[PDB]
Design a protein around this ligand. Structure first.
Ligand SMILES: [Zn+2]
Ligand SMILES: [Zn+2]
Ligand SMILES: [Zn+2]
Ligand SMILES: [Zn+2]
Ligand SMILES: [Zn+2]
Ligand SMILES: [Zn+2]
Ligand SMILES: [Zn+2]
Ligand SMILES: [Zn+2]
Ligand SMILES: [Zn+2]
Lengths: 155, 155
């Protein structure tokens, strides 16, 4: 609605994101980050990694199992200061692709953050779009952020 | 998606609701109730009341103020056994109409229930669609129930 397309035919995906967000240039494996001019905390981001003959997202595990691993390994690893909580893990299908959809909280010593990610495999690569807001702002942004996350298409 | 239209041109409104729900015949001011065959707890319902020259929903108050009143007077009144909690109150516009959207919890000695309602005025009448699920089931039904509530159109 007040959203704006990002189409990346190099890397093979698109999403909508809010109008008036601007891109920050970051390092691999993160492909794009866009964040709010004012609330630079609120952002969307796409990660791309590769994989040996993992044709499908279902062979990585169930969405909960994938969720657990995303948080274990990538979002709240090691001791990165930060703790995390998996809220919900579910699946969608759009075109002939399964996406896994994960909702999680992240605390970072403490500012608490609320997130939603969509993961989908295609062409030997895993694609994770992730949107994120301060806990305080979640309820206000929840329905926009669900439109962002469900606008994610991998070719 | 797996939803089915109810169009009431007598009373001047429509909504989508899940396929395989069936109608229960109830008394005024409730116009329609539909509920799940198995989980007869899960339901959608439309209430219709009249009003003297209240042309608009904005003149009843802000959405929070309306929320407070819906719960005070209609959903958890008097001592009806039951207690209630207003979670969120927001507004939408579809066609040239403002709808108020309210999320609330209701406890009933105790089974806890989670609800979402849309209220809109037109033609000297207030229209409240309300969908409701056991707390346990909320997360599973949340996104379907938001499609139900946002499919509500008053003419
Ligand atoms: Zn790219
Ligand atoms: Zn902004
Ligand atoms: Zn687990
Ligand atoms: Zn949260
Ligand atoms: Zn919610
Ligand atoms: Zn009717
Ligand atoms: Zn059912
Ligand atoms: Zn109040
Ligand atoms: Zn609840």
């Amino acid at each position: 609605s007040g959203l704006q397309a990002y189409v990346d035919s190099y890397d093979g995906y698109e999403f909508l994101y809010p109008r008036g967000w601007v891109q920050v240039q970051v390092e691999d494996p993160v492909d794009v980050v866009f964040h709010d001019i004012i609330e630079t905390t609120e952002n969307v981001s796409v990660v791309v990694n590769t994989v040996a003959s993992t044709k499908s997202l279902e062979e990585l595990g169930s969405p909960e199992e994938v969720g657990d691993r995303l948080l274990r390994n990538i979002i709240a690893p090691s001791e990165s200061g930060r703790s995390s909580a998996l809220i919900a893990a579910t699946s969608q299908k759009a075109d002939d692709k399964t996406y896994y959809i994960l909702e999680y909280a992240v605390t970072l010593p403490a500012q608490q953050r609320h997130n939603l990610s969509s993961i989908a495999v295609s062409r030997g690569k895993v694609y994770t779009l992730s949107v994120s807001a301060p806990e305080e702002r979640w309820p206000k942004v929840e329905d926009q952020f669900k439109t962002i996350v469900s606008s994610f298409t991998v070719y």
